[PDB]
Amino acid sequence: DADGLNLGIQWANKNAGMTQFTNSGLPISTAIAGANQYNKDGTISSSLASA
Amino acid sequence: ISSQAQLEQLSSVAAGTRYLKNKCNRSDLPADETIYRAAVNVGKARGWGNIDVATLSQNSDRLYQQLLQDSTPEATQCSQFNRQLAPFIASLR
Amino acid sequence: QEVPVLTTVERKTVGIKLKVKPQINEGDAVLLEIEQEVSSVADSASSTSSDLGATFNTRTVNNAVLVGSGETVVVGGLLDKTVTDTADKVPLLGDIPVIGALFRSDSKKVSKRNLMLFIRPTIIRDRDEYRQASSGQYTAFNNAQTKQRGKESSEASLSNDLLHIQAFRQVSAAIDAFNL
Amino acid sequence: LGSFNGIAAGFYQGNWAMLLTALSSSTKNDILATPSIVTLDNMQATFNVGQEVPVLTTVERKTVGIKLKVKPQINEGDAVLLEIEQEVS
Amino acid sequence: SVADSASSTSSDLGATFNTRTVNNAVLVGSGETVVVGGLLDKTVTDTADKVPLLGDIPVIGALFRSDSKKVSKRNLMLFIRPTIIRDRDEYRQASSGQYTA
């Protein structure tokens, strides 16, 4: 038997800092690159993080 | 397959119950006629067509002879039956 | 099953290899230099370097013991937990537990394990003693067999007719039919 | 940036800039191993759990686990002798 | 037998060779059903995962768990039975009857 748990948040602001956590499975890099690429292209492009 | 399996099942329990009474010291069991009436009552409770008592008696006799002539040790027969005619006994009491 | 490794290669077996050596000493006592293993292969993901692809999970026991005839005996045992924790937080922060909980980042996990071994012999002298052991044990089989799916079985039933040792086979059968 | 962890705060007032950088990290690990066995005195029993993996020495079989083996000698009414060896790998 | 639905063949030797192998010695009476060897075994495993703090109301929260469960049961039984045969007569019954079987 094996049990496991995790928990964590992250923050971002153009004028402010950056709170990243890689253990989580997804950086903010996934986000800043997800939405500016999204709304730049209009929609999803496979260039985004395959994670 | 309509009137044969019903007769064989009732004849089998009546023959085995008589065996138990006569050969396995089951003195709590009633007389042969009462055992025959109890086997008829099992058929009636199941909604079975009326089974002739004398046809049941004749068949049951034949099965009782088969239990008696069997080359099976008595001890084994009595134990086997006593555990096979258990529910039946309950119905007849 | 059996699977080959590259040592050009040879045959390799993975299963439950239980072998023993029984010595009857006293009226009732026995001696058992037993050894065995329950092995399998997992390979969710493992180290195969395009060479020999194999994990061969195994547990292997061997020893010698004196045991009474009809007895449950503890041979070998293992029980183990394993915990690990991972934390990281911006310094000086997260310190107010109710409030600051918004800056920690937590990953915790555990693993527990246990393993138990039991053996039990029985002496058998002659035919009589044999019948109970076989018949009863076989019943232990039919218990789980007929436990879920209720099917009629030519082999099993017939085999029982063997373990029993012609009219009795008719009447007991008929009674069985009736009580369905 | 794909690997960074922690915080850093962006500031700009004309000509200057500054970046604060910090992080805290910790890690904790535990284990426990309780095996048990029986045997006679003079004959050795041995015991092991764990997987098995091959190295390239063409290669051979290698085991990784908890190989606990001993040799019990009963001397006095109550005393014993244990030439034990084992490893948790 | 050989199964090979999917197995470890590394372009070397492709084989599984499922097997069960018995050997022993026994004393047995002439006409007798004899239990030689036996195995019976079940094997269960479970897999669960859920967003924490949720799924806790069984009737309601059942909408967040994600469940995969499976079992395997197994059993194996071995029986032997000899018969002695002295001469022609004893032979006829054994052959004829068996052939009828």
**Phi and psi (nearest 5°) for E89?**
-55, -65
**Which candidate, D60, A3, B56, E24, places its Cα nearest to that of C54?**
D60
Q: How far is C90 from chain D (nearest CA, A)?
A: 5
Residue numbers after which chain C is interrupted (C to N above 2.5 A) read 7, 165
A neighbours by CB contacts (3+ pairs under 8 Å): C, D
Residues paired with residue D35 on neighbouring β-strands, in sequence order? C78
Check if C154 contacts E (Cβ < 8 Å). no
Tell me the CA distances in angstroms from E16 to C38, C43, C49, C51, E3, one per residue in order: 17, 16, 21, 18, 7
Rounded Cα gap, residues C165 and C155, in angstroms: 16
Interface contact B9-C172, CB threshold 8 A:
no
DSSP state of A15: T
Q: For chain C, how are helix, strand and coil distributed in percent, rounded to 5? A: 25, 35, 40
Q: Which residues contact D34 (CB under 8 A, 6 or more apart)?
A: C77, C78, C79, C80
Length of chain C: 180
Check if C107 contacts A (Cβ < 8 Å). yes
CB C175 within 8 A of CB B84: yes
User: Across the interface, which of E12, E17, E79 has its CB nearest the CB of C2?
Assistant: E17
C neighbours by CB contacts (3+ pairs under 8 Å): A, B, D, E
Interface contact A2-C104, CB threshold 8 A:
no
Return the H-helix or E-strand segment holding A6.
strand A2-8
User: Across the interface, which of A2, A5, A23 has its CB nearest the CB of C111?
Assistant: A2
**Which candidate, E80, C79, C168, places its Cα nearest to that of B12?**
C168
Q: Give me C175's structure tokens.
A: 């009674």
> For chain D, what is the radius of gyration of the CA atoms?
28
- Burial call D66-83: b when 16+ CB within 10 Å, e when fewer: bbbebbbeeeeeeeeeee
Q: Determine whether C149 is exposed, middle or buried from the number of CB atoms within 10 Å of its CB (0-12, 13-18, 19+).
A: exposed
DSSP state letters, D5-70:
-BB----EETTEE----B-EEEEEE----EEEE---SSS-EEEEEEEE--B----B--EEEB-EEE
DSSP three-state, residue E11: coil
Residues of A in contact with C112 (CB under 8 A): 1-2
| B–D contact: 3+ Cβ pairs < 8 A | no
CB C41 within 8 A of CB C56: yes
- A 10 A CB-CB count for E62 gives 11
Interface contact D5-C88, CB threshold 8 A:
yes
Q: Which of D46, D49, D89 to mutate to test the interface with C (most CBs of C within 10 A)?
A: D49
Identify the contact set of chain C against chain D, taking CB-CB distances under 8 A. Answer: 5-7, 33, 46-47, 49, 51-52, 54-66, 74-91, 115
Interface contact B87-C179, CB threshold 8 A:
yes
Rounded Cα gap, residues D38 and C66, in angstroms: 10
Residues paired with residue E66 on neighbouring β-strands, in sequence order? E49
- Cα atoms in the 13 Å half-sphere on the side-chain side of C69: 9
Rounded Cα gap, residues D36 and C114, in angstroms: 11
| CA E83, E86, E88, E89 torsion-angle sign | negative
- A 10 A CB-CB count for D41 gives 13
Interface contact E38-C4, CB threshold 8 A:
no
Return the residue of C nearest to B46 by Cα: C178
Going along chain C, which residue ranges are E strands?
22-24, 30-32, 34-37, 58-63, 66-67, 73-89, 105-119
CB E55 within 8 A of CB E65: yes
Q: Give me C2's structure tokens.
A: 């059996």
Q: How far is C176 from chain D (nearest CA, A)?
A: 48
Residues of B in contact with C168 (CB under 8 A): 66-67, 70, 72, 77, 80
Q: Give me C66's structure tokens.
A: 């004196």
Interface contact C175-B84, CB threshold 8 A:
yes
Q: Give me C154's structure tokens.
A: 């030519």
Q: Which residues contact B60 (CB under 8 A, 6 or more apart)?
A: B10, B11, B12, B14, B15, B18, B36, B39
Residues of C in contact with B11 (CB under 8 A): 174
CB B39 within 8 A of CB B18: no
Rounded Cα gap, residues B92 and E63, in angstroms: 54
Rounded Cα gap, residues E7 and C53, in angstroms: 11
DSSP state letters, chain B:
--SHHHHHHHHHHHHHHHHHHHHS--TTS--HHHHHHHHHHHHHHTTPPPPPHHHHHHHHHHHHHHHHHSSS-HHHHHHHHHHHSHHHHHHH-
**Which candidate, C21, C50, C24, C20, places its Cα nearest to that of C36?**
C20
Resolution (A): 4.3
Rounded Cα gap, residues C134 and A5, in angstroms: 51
- A 10 A CB-CB count for C145 gives 18
Place of tokens 């492709």: E14
CB C109 within 8 A of CB A3: yes
Place of tokens 């960074």: D4
Task: Convert E23-77 into a string of H (helix), E (strand) and C (coil).
Answer: CCCCCCCCCCCEEEEEEEEEEEEEEEECCCCCCCCHHHHCCCCEEEEEEEEEEEE
DSSP state of C42: -
- A 10 A CB-CB count for C161 gives 12
Rounded Cα gap, residues E36 and E25, in angstroms: 10
CB E84 within 8 A of CB E28: no
Q: Which residues contact B21 (CB under 8 A, 6 or more apart)?
A: B27, B29, B32, B35
Interface contact D27-C85, CB threshold 8 A:
yes
**Which candidate, B65, B37, E2, A48, places its Cα nearest to that of C168?**
B65
- A 10 A CB-CB count for E84 gives 9
Classify residue B74 as left (phi > 0), alpha (psi -120 to 50) or beta: alpha
Interface contact C172-B80, CB threshold 8 A:
yes
What B37-40 contacts at long range (C-beta under 8 Å, 24+ apart), as own/partner pairs, is B38/B14, B38/B88, B38/B91, B38/B92, B39/B10, B39/B11, B39/B13, B39/B14, B39/B88, B40/B10
| C–D contact: 3+ Cβ pairs < 8 A | yes
